[PDB]
Design a protein around this ligand. Sequence first.
Ligand SMILES: NC(=O)c1ccc[n+]([C@@H]2O[C@H](COP(=O)([O-])OP(=O)(O)OC[C@H]3O[C@@H](n4cnc5c(N)ncnc54)[C@H](O)[C@@H]3O)[C@@H](O)[C@H]2O)c1
Ligand SMILES: NC(=O)c1ccc[n+]([C@@H]2O[C@H](COP(=O)([O-])OP(=O)(O)OC[C@H]3O[C@@H](n4cnc5c(N)ncnc54)[C@H](O)[C@@H]3O)[C@@H](O)[C@H]2O)c1
Ligand SMILES: NC(=O)c1ccc[n+]([C@@H]2O[C@H](COP(=O)([O-])OP(=O)(O)OC[C@H]3O[C@@H](n4cnc5c(N)ncnc54)[C@H](O)[C@@H]3O)[C@@H](O)[C@H]2O)c1
Ligand SMILES: NC(=O)c1ccc[n+]([C@@H]2O[C@H](COP(=O)([O-])OP(=O)(O)OC[C@H]3O[C@@H](n4cnc5c(N)ncnc54)[C@H](O)[C@@H]3O)[C@@H](O)[C@H]2O)c1
Ligand SMILES: NC(=O)c1ccc[n+]([C@@H]2O[C@H](COP(=O)([O-])OP(=O)(O)OC[C@H]3O[C@@H](n4cnc5c(N)ncnc54)[C@H](O)[C@@H]3O)[C@@H](O)[C@H]2O)c1
Lengths: 361, 361, 361, 361, 361
Amino acid sequence: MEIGVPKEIKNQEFRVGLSPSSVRTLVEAGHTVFIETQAGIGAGFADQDYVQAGAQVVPSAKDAWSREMVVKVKEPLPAEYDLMQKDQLLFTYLHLAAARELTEQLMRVGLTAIAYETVELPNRSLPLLTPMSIIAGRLSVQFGARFLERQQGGRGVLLGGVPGVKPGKVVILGGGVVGTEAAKMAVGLGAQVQIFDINVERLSYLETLFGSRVELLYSNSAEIETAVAEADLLIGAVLVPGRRAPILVPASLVEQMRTGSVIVDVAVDQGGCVETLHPTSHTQPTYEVFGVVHYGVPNMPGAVPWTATQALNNSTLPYVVKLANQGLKALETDDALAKGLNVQAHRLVHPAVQQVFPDLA
Amino acid sequence: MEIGVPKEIKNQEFRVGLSPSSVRTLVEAGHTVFIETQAGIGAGFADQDYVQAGAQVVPSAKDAWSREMVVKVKEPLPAEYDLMQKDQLLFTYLHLAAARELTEQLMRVGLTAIAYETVELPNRSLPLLTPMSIIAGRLSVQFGARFLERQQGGRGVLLGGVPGVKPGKVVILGGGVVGTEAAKMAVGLGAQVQIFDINVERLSYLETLFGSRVELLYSNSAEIETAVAEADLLIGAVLVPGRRAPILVPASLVEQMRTGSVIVDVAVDQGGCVETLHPTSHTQPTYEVFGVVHYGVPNMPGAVPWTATQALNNSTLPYVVKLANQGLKALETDDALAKGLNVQAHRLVHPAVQQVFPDLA
Amino acid sequence: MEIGVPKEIKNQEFRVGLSPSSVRTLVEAGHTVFIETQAGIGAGFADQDYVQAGAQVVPSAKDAWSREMVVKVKEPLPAEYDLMQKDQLLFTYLHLAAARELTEQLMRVGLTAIAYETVELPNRSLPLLTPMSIIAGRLSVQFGARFLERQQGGRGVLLGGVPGVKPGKVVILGGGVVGTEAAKMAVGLGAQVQIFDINVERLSYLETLFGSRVELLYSNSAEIETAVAEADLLIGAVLVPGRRAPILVPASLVEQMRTGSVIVDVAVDQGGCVETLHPTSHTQPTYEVFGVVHYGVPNMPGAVPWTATQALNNSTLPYVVKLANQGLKALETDDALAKGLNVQAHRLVHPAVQQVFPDLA
Amino acid sequence: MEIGVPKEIKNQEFRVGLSPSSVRTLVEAGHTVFIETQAGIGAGFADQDYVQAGAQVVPSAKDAWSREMVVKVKEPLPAEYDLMQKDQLLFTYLHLAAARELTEQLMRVGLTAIAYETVELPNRSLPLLTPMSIIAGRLSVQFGARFLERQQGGRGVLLGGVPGVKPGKVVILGGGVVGTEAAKMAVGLGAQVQIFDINVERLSYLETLFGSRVELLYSNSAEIETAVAEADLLIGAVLVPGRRAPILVPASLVEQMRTGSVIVDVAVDQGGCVETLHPTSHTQPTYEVFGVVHYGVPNMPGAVPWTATQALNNSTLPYVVKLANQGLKALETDDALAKGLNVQAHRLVHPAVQQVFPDLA
Amino acid sequence: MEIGVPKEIKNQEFRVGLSPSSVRTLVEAGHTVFIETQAGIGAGFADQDYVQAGAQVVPSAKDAWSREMVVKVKEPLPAEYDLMQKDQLLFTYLHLAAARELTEQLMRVGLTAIAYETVELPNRSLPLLTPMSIIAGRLSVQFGARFLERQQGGRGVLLGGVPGVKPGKVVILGGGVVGTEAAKMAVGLGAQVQIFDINVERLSYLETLFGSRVELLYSNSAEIETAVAEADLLIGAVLVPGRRAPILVPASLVEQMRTGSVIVDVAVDQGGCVETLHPTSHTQPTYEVFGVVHYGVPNMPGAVPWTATQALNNSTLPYVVKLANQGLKALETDDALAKGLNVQAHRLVHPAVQQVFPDLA
Ligand SMILES: NC(=O)c1ccc[n+]([C@@H]2O[C@H](COP(=O)([O-])OP(=O)(O)OC[C@H]3O[C@@H](n4cnc5c(N)ncnc54)[C@H](O)[C@@H]3O)[C@@H](O)[C@H]2O)c1
Ligand SMILES: NC(=O)c1ccc[n+]([C@@H]2O[C@H](COP(=O)([O-])OP(=O)(O)OC[C@H]3O[C@@H](n4cnc5c(N)ncnc54)[C@H](O)[C@@H]3O)[C@@H](O)[C@H]2O)c1
Ligand SMILES: NC(=O)c1ccc[n+]([C@@H]2O[C@H](COP(=O)([O-])OP(=O)(O)OC[C@H]3O[C@@H](n4cnc5c(N)ncnc54)[C@H](O)[C@@H]3O)[C@@H](O)[C@H]2O)c1
Ligand SMILES: NC(=O)c1ccc[n+]([C@@H]2O[C@H](COP(=O)([O-])OP(=O)(O)OC[C@H]3O[C@@H](n4cnc5c(N)ncnc54)[C@H](O)[C@@H]3O)[C@@H](O)[C@H]2O)c1
Ligand SMILES: NC(=O)c1ccc[n+]([C@@H]2O[C@H](COP(=O)([O-])OP(=O)(O)OC[C@H]3O[C@@H](n4cnc5c(N)ncnc54)[C@H](O)[C@@H]3O)[C@@H](O)[C@H]2O)c1
């Protein structure tokens, strides 16, 4: 089939729909791929690498959008609304329940849109988001260490300390995928680490990973209060299915933290579990409240596009191949794929997006 | 005795001569300490903490400089030349072989100046520099990870990678104190690590620390060339006694590195082992040569003043106490202290500084 | 019941149906066991040990084959066709889909034959093969190290290297049971290790076992090519259910490998994932193609009969006991056992073997 | 200076005096190197690699022996006696106290001969032998595992066992360099390990390396007897300065060992600590006594010439460079080098070799 | 709702139904809690702590028993039979199949009684017992070490030994929750450890936790006999669903053990797997049979009430909250809770307790 890969146009978005290794694999399956020049450059892939792989490098987005299947990272923007085609297959992150205009647009056009984030296993797991959660967890500590540096606004604490001197104290709220990857890094830098979770069985499992090196604590307000007050680095990594996140950290608790301490709340979209936290810019990634540094920049994985592009591809690829092979019939063979389906032929198909635009259904 | 601690005035210097725990200890020994207001604040110590410790908080530097002993972090600046006194004891980092004017100043004044960096054991070890080498080694990786982020100018590589994706490759030139601490951090973040050294016995010792997790390689041009070409993060940590550092990495080698890769040369004063590296600012910590990011900001430990102040104190303290107790006679009891002596009563005493200002002796 | 254990007669087969500990256990359950003299000697078990266990040691195979139940390791050979009886229970590895004559023989005779390799759990797992996969994985590295020795034909590389010198590079294709055990050994010898797999969730799990000590890579032709070219030791450990193995390594790739490098493809029966690999002898376990040493000897576990006999027994025993107790009714109580049933009363019962000898059904 | 490297002619000797990386380094120092064609091929180095390094590849040994300095691995053989020159510098392993004829030959010729094995530090350490001890220690386990395989003559025991089955038991007599490297490998393969030593302080140090994973036992006849009787693999790694090795294992003890168990005595030249052990061939590396497999092949490191050549070079190189630079005056600057001196201008200089050929002095 | 917490009156019982953190959490949910004075003191919780949490501290048990819901640790005793009320909710450990009188009492009264130990998941797991199994496993080793001390009656063996001296040998029968926690501690003290289990898949899993540090052995009489004879510390940790425990250790085996060796059978209620073991007192926790020390004191977790109270609460809490919120309707929403139901309105509801008092149903 013909596969197009336009360059990402969203602000600060350096990832790319397909890496060269993916392309190669696709080309060996009988398919042909068209990629816009420079599409891969923010991620570290030259057009050259794409040609070596069997890609046809196209000079414009029009040329890339004109294919039967388009594979991207982010949702289409208004600047590209006119590039879309009636019978395309669009496979990318959509987040439709947050973009009515976008939802209507796809609807008018009549294509079929499959969202990475709705492809779901019986497991109830979302295989195409995980890779991003792993990365965010790892980055949280890296960003946190930077902001604990004096020139960056923090107290001037080295996470690992040095023999004779106290190490930094990292408190992680939530021991799921993100919280677990964060703990791995903090431990690697030498910090003293505490993880809170409400699921004891998850806590038991974490003990198999860390042994007695990390403190594994049941999530209750009383212990949270004490721990948070002593933290140099607080990482929010909580997720709850039927809703937005619980505020485990009220402004009053924040007020009790040490000056120059830092909070990184990875749970930014769904609210955060920290009361004083809101999303931040990039020309201004942080702000202070009570002398405590706040970091609320989202899509953390965008800081490592080379690593992030491959991680995503490793997971999307088999789906890309199935679609290229069976086209629309794959949704009838693949239940997970069938669940990624959001829009088709002017109809809003995803039940979740329906309950949000009940009048769009 | 009376001990004074002025606030550091050098640019970007947030450390402080004595921490509150040190002060307390000093006060319990019979001594009294005077500290300039706000002297400890960049390091995270309020005047309050100093008063609780037994310190007398003085409102001006004059008041702090007027003591029989002054304890600081950096060398005196011209702005303080008039504050110095004839019979003081000055204990701080001096680096006289690089400051003639300063050397002459101390000479005129007639005090006795003891340099942290010349206090030396029979071991030939410099006990008061080590703490700073440990910190620099640990920070190098932390800074390196930041600069490998796309927005910071790097390729966009996560050091630890994610299962399925290649981890970052870190190459460390020199397996001494700095190189060893750097390896500890890189390994902690999940990177693939290679350390080069010319001392096999040091390599053998490192194996006892890391096992087979790190690649331990003999330093020869041939292997260096190959390794460096594949690095995401290159850390220079070489030191050679009788001179400046060897250029293990010529511009030609740098030219062969991947775009967006980063070099952190901790060996900045003595030259660096990297040809294209020079010191950098803070309003501009890095620059590019061949698409490769260069970081040459010195006194790395200044980024974590809270941790760095305590590490230094843990080591200087026993010397501070000996001086306060025995005053000048300590140099006659302590050989290491006797070696820290640089200037006394208008005479240049340190042989090393003499061979540099042979006409000052 | 009466249980017989003949000595294995197949070439190079030193294992034995029951170890002495098994026998003891069987005897304490009310059963009696007859074993041919010397049956256990290749595995390190003297007849003495068998008598201490409660076994009756019989002088001939006839005496051992004449029992209501016979327990062996390998399939019956033509030399024993006349020893079989109409109503026996035969429990051993059969591999009928590869032995028509054998399949017809059991059919004529009219016994019931249960194959270790078809006993299967709902899990779809084959509990009686695993023990052999674990052993093969561990041996692969052991054999590989031997063949990397100069006198054995290899390049003369020590897997662990020595501080100052590069360790050997081991590449494992497939991260399942075999590939995982191989990685454990390679890591134990100090090698640099890469594992490829197409299942990301398996890759994630492996990270919980190895941390960042092993490189965990997604199986794609592009990365495979690069990795394989740099390998000292290549281990094939791929398995795919609905068929034979994929050739992940074409002769062209093999041609690009270093002279004296070695390939051990554990996936020998089902083809191998290496193009240039074919089964080898024992009077000649290896051969060279492009200066690269090939090892294709099967039934690797036969090299450690003492360890292999016990591992198998630990798993077969509970089934042996159930059969001795309930005889044929066990297949009606045990679904896994019911699945091991291949032949009974002249009829070919196993659906898998039926689809192979569709005219035998 | 001119440096020659002849091809090694001794039987089964595949190492080479200088690797290509060494050569390169030498060439960059102002020196020129001549190497006999194919000299590096048994170690995995093509002439090509030597030319790339700056070597001049010579067609004959005569051409290589004709230089002011010759660098080899083994001692000169009678076939090369005529190639030697009056004023050469010969640097290689000599073992003169075992070769009278050779000793006389060097004497006649009048060159100066420096033996790797006599270069000694104040430490009393022999820096140029260690690399070989490390390798032998690692290989011992590798060879031992092979001989425990049934087809190789052993009991058929997998060192690591499998969950549910006992691992192999490895007993190491001597916890020095060799014994320690052996333990590292055995532990890596999963074996149960015991190390005996008479030096408690060495035992204490080993605990810092292995923790409680290895049993660390004081060397006394009583415990030795018990342990040895239960071993699958016995490794002799004892060394005593003023003499030959103690027989810690009398034939009577050997008689008590399990059939198919194996003994690898790395202490072969100095006798061995095992009574029934003698050196073996290569066309016959082992023999049996009491059903116990004996391995007594020496120069174990010769099995991995690629790894062994580099390990040796990493250590000899700085000495090779000093000699090329200062020629004979290096012995007057280098005490360790001065100690390597065995023969010069017809005189036997090495005190140790003198006390052996008291009439040659 | 109103929640009461009486002080535990059973002998040697220091735990308490709710910890202060639990209380706080309950109070924030809209509920009010009444606790008898001193109820928390044996566990380390002052009334003060309870008041800070929002508890109302009541002076008598009557006051605590008079609530709509009573939360305790142990079963009600005759001394409290008169305190119970018709429509209460009683949530605590009951063990009714062992207390007929108690069972009849609850029956008369007409309350609804929910037993911690019958709350069960589809998993068939008993979430409210696990926490106690983990603790018992950890304590077993701690108690065992104490009894191996000479003054306590044991042989005088230090589990970890010291470099040069054999470590203690610990044998664990059963590799489930208890056996696994015991192994963790024994390994932590430096002992040589063997675990036996009949489930190979459990053995495989344990290898992922311990690697090759522990010996993982299949449970068969032959190996058990040998291992037990050499043990310093034997820990019984076997559980079998449809019955009482198997005697894996007959008195005859015990007779073969070393004098001063110790047995701790955690499997005390269900019999023990050790023939010579019976429950013991506290004024006499052990006894000897054949010079072997026996420890059979039950409810091991009672020795660490501070730790044990919190572990239990972490697990019971969510159930306590559900009950307080939905009262009786929770059993209709919660299947696990519905399974904890033993008695209600004079009727015996639990099928298991019915089959024991078939005439009570
Ligand atoms: N900013 C970014 O780039 C980015 C990327 C990915 C995910 N995230 C966010 O990070 C969060 C973590 O996602 P995840 O994949 O780890 O989910 P997860 O389900 O793997 O982990 C969440 C964990 O939180 C625990 N939790 C829930 N309530 C809790 C409570 N009251 N106290 C303590 N722990 C509680 C759960 O028991 C669970 O273990 C989500 O909110 C997600 O949206 C941000
Ligand atoms: N910028 C900062 O804030 C800061 C702070 C401290 C130290 N440093 C610098 O960092 C360097 C490292 O200091 P250190 O305490 O680790 O010294 P060290 O002696 O502990 O380590 C240096 C090591 O380099 C090795 N080395 C020398 N020549 C080599 C060669 N050709 N190849 C490979 N390795 C070689 C030596 O064998 C030694 O092991 C010095 O140059 C020091 O001035 C910078
Ligand atoms: N010679 C012997 O004595 C012996 C003994 C046992 C097994 N074997 C063979 O070894 C192989 C391994 O068996 P196992 O028990 O490990 O199976 P397994 O299922 O546990 O492992 C196989 C793994 O291969 C992976 N795989 C499949 N296709 C792949 C691809 N294209 N790239 C990379 N990985 C891929 C799967 O995802 C899986 O994780 C089989 O072929 C089996 O027949 C040989
Ligand atoms: N065959 C080969 O290729 C080869 C290569 C190198 C070394 N070797 C030999 O291996 C031996 C080991 O050499 P090394 O470098 O380990 O020496 P080492 O000094 O590092 O180790 C020897 C150790 O043996 C211990 N020892 C001495 N007497 C003992 C006794 N009665 N019981 C127990 N331990 C005792 C010492 O305390 C010491 O720790 C030597 O005999 C050497 O000649 C063979
Ligand atoms: N005294 C106390 O305070 C206390 C507290 C909790 C549990 N216990 C007791 O401890 C025992 C262990 O409980 P658990 O939670 O570990 O159960 P579990 O199911 O987690 O562990 C029991 C294990 O025993 C194994 N096993 C069964 N039969 C065996 C045999 N013949 N040989 C070897 N292993 C065998 C099973 O395969 C299983 O892995 C139970 O009997 C329980 O009643 C005592």
